[PDB]
Amino acid sequence: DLLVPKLTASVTDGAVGVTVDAPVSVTAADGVLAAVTMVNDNGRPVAGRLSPDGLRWSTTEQLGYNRRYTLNATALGLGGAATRQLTFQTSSPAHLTMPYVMPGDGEVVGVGEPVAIRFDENIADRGAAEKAIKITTNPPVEGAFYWLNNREVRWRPEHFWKPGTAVDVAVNTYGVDLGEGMFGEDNVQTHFTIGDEVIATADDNTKILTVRVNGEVVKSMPTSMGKDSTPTANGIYIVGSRYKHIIMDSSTYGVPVNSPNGYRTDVDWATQISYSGVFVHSAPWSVGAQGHTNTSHGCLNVSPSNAQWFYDHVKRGDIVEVVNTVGGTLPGIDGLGDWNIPWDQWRAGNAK
Ligand SMILES: *C(=O)CC(=O)[C@@H](C)CC(=O)C(=O)O
């Protein structure tokens, strides 16, 4: 004997806290869908599509926070007709946080470049945030998340990227509970590629900044680094932004200008390598000391032509390594200091 059609939805009638990170769907068995409509509270229909075989209907546009939706579906079969009405209520956030991802879409960056997702609000459930961030790499390589502060999480492999790696970042935070009633305001997505290996090494024993490109020495720059009382920290630096010129203002990095180690200086050809305020930059006033003596507040002073060369040939995500200074080691949570955190510590993370 014949059977009556059955209607199954990806939600149920009376549901609350329905999350809007996924489409809503309806499926017919023992029959086909003859009509499916979904309206919000205000009678506005929601866009949807019925599969060609008539069995599956799904929403096709974003579903909104704080809504009551009503589904009406009818299924017909040889055995008769069935109709259902489902009303459900979606998540009601207390807060919304918007994520901002670096590096930029379509960019080509150095082998030291981490994926960065910065939220504009403190994240209570770091684990939920991590889970919602989908990273694809090609060639595939293991990586892991680490939080630099309450708002910004970083993802990187254990070692520098292999040049030519495609990296894809899907921050799928819309509809996701990030804790304490905070939900993602929107999704973001970036895709970037790893370019040549560029590693510049500043050795305090020689006072030379050597630039190597895929293992080959292409540039050797006499440099003057931080004087003993304001040394350049040892360790690994990720290259950040670059400037044809910039006013370096110590107060930006915590030191009052009118302090003994304060300064406010206009400089050319400046490449930032730490949030703490270390740059490679043109320093014509210390060209005599470069290659011989440290005289700066911590920056890598090099000649005008070498600073410009550095500006022209080094890109975001390239690496500067400092060795043998009287300084300590650059903090791992500096912002550009990710690689100074040991991998076991990085991999274990701090989602807590
Ligand atoms: C960088 O943060 C500050 C520096 O170390 C350079 C600007 C050089 C410098 O301060 C100097 O007086 O030579």
Author numbering: 56 to 407
Provide excerpts from the study.
The final step of PG biosynthesis in Mtb is catalyzed by two different classes of enzymes, namely the D,D-transpeptidases (also known as Penicillin Binding Proteins – PBPs) and L,D-transpeptidases (Ldts). Conversely, Ldts catalyze the crosslinking of disaccharyl-tetrapeptide polymers by forming a transpeptide bond between the third amino acid in adjacent stem peptides thereby generating 3 → 3 crosslinkages between mDAP residues. Approximately two-thirds of the linkages in Mtb PG are of 3 → 3 type and their synthesis is catalyzed by the Ldts, highlighting the importance of these non-classical transpeptidases to this pathogen. Mtb lacking LdtMt2 is severely attenuated for growth, virulence, has deformed cell walls and exhibits an increased susceptibility to β-lactams.
In summary, biapenem and tebipenem bind to the outer cavity of LdtMt2 and inactivate the enzyme, ultimately forming the same adduct following degradation. Additional electron density connected to the catalytic Cys354 thiol group and extending to the outer cavity was observed in LdtMt2–biapenem and LdtMt2–tebipenem complexes. The carboxyl substituent at C5 docks in a pocket and accepts hydrogen bonds from the NH groups of His352, Gly353, and Cys354. After a short incubation, the difference between primary peaks of the mass spectra of unreacted LdtMt2 and the biapenem-LdtMt2 complex was Δm/z = 225 Da, which is less than the expected increase for an intact biapenem adduct (Δm/z = 352 Da). After 40 min and up to 24 h, the primary signal differences stabilized at 180 Da (45 Da less than the difference observed after a short incubation). After a 45 min incubation of biapenem and LdtMt2, the difference between mass spectra primary signals stabilized at around a 180 Da, which is 45 Da less than difference observed after a short incubation and closely matches the difference expected (183 Da, step 7). Decarboxylation of the MTOA adduct results in a Δm/z of 140.1 Da, that closely matches the 139.5 Da observed for LdtMt2-biapenem by mass spectrometry. Few biapenem degradation paths exist yielding this observed adduct mass. Thus, this finding provides strong additional evidence supporting the identification of MTOA as the adduct observed in the LdtMt2-biapenem crystal.
